């Protein structure tokens, strides 16, 4: 099982070797408008 708490959240990114958070589809790989990643 994975954890979903504040330290776990930042730990997953700071020290990816010890990551234990849910895995997800990156927003860039979803069916979203082009403007979603191009700021004005």
Partner 1 sequence: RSVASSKLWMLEFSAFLEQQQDPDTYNKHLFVHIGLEAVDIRQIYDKFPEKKGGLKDLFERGPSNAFFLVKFWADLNTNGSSFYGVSSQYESPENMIITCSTKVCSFGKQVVEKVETEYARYENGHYSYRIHRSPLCEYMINFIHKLKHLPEKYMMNSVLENFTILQVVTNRDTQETLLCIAYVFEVSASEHGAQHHIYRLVK
Residues that bind partner 1 (CB under 8 A): 4-6, 9-10, 13-14, 21-22, 24, 26-27, 30-33, 35-36, 39-40
> Judged by CB, which is closer to partner 1: 17, or 31?
31
Residue 23 CB, nearest distance to partner 1 (Å)? 10
Distance CA 32, CA 10 (A): 26
Q: How far is the CB of 17 from partner 1 (least distance, A)?
A: 15
- The answer to whether the CB of 18 falls within 8 A of the CB of 11 is yes
DSSP H or E stretch at residue 11: helix 6-14
């Amino acid at each position: 099982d994975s954890e979903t708490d504040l330290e776990a959240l930042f730990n997953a990114v700071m020290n990816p070797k010890t990551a234990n958070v849910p895995q997800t589809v990156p927003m860039r790989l979803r069916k979203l408008p082009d403007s979603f990643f191009k700021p004005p």
